[PDB]
Structure 1
Amino acid sequence: SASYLPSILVPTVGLILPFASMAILFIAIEK
């Protein structure tokens, strides 16, 4: 049981994925 993987995966999907998804979708308004 890798007890360290949510310490990486929970923030990188919880906050930084709705940064780059805001960039991909919001610039994809104009792309």
Structure 2
Amino acid sequence: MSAQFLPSILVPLVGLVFPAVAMASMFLYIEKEEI
């Protein structure tokens, strides 16, 4: 496939960075007291 390096960067981004960021943001938002 063209640009074999792309999956090695996108898979961890969508499975590790994006989920951690999304969970942290959701946790901080669902307990804001004043949204």
Instruction: Say whether the fold is shared (TM-score over 0.5).
Output: yes
Q: Which has the higher contact order (CA 8 A, sep 6+)?
A: 2
What 5-or-longer segments of structure 1 have no aligned partner?
none
Return structure 1 stretches of 4+ with deviation > 3 angstroms: none
Gaps of 5+ in 2: none
Taking structure 2 as the reference length, the TM-score comes to: 0.70
Give the number of equivalent residue pairs. 31
Aligned alpha-carbon RMSD (Å): 1.1
Quote the sequence identity (%). 55
